[PDB]
Amino acid sequence: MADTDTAEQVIASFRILASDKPYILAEELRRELPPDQAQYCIKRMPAYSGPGSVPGALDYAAFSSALYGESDL
């Protein structure tokens, strides 16, 4: 809605699941995303990357770029 660009859509969509957060927790994807989706994603998004992060945060923004862009080809 307020954003659109394939990669931006996933970030805006993930932000909603993480509850207005620059990162998402593994447990959140398990209860917010099909158990199978949380496990697969929890692997893509590296270990978040913020200043006031938390003990167990993940960055879906890094994973979004890989889904629509992985290695040059």
């Binding site: 859509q9 996933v10 805006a12 969509s13 993930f14 909603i16 699941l17 917010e32 995303l33 099909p34 989706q37 697969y40 994603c41 893509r44 879906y60 979004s64 890989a66 889904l67």
Partner: peptide, 23 residues
């Protein structure tokens, strides 16, 4: 309705990368 729509986008995007998974 707003949150469910976001999950559809994340799930749809997740299935895209999964399609690249052999059997």
């Amino acid at each position: 309705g707003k949150k469910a729509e976001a999950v559809a986008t994340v799930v749809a995007a997740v299935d895209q990368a999964r399609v690249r998974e052999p059997r």
